[PDB]
Design a protein around this ligand. Structure first.
Ligand code: CL
Length: 55
């Protein structure tokens, strides 16, 4: 699971100005992580919320 998380973190940091994977990108991320598309989407929702959450 560390590799799965690191796959998504790496994508996220490379796309900080638009941290919203397209449908095709979600599909590739699912393949790379071994997570479902649903899990990939939920991870990104939670990541974007974490970035903006108050100190
Ligand atoms: Cl990282």
């Amino acid at each position: 699971p560390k590799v799965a998380t690191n796959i998504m973190r790496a994508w996220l940091f490379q796309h900080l100005t638009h941290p919203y994977p397209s449908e095709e990108q979600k599909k590739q991320l699912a393949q790379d992580t071994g997570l479902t598309i649903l899990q990939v989407n939920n991870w990104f929702i939670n990541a974007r919320r974490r970035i903006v959450q108050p100190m």
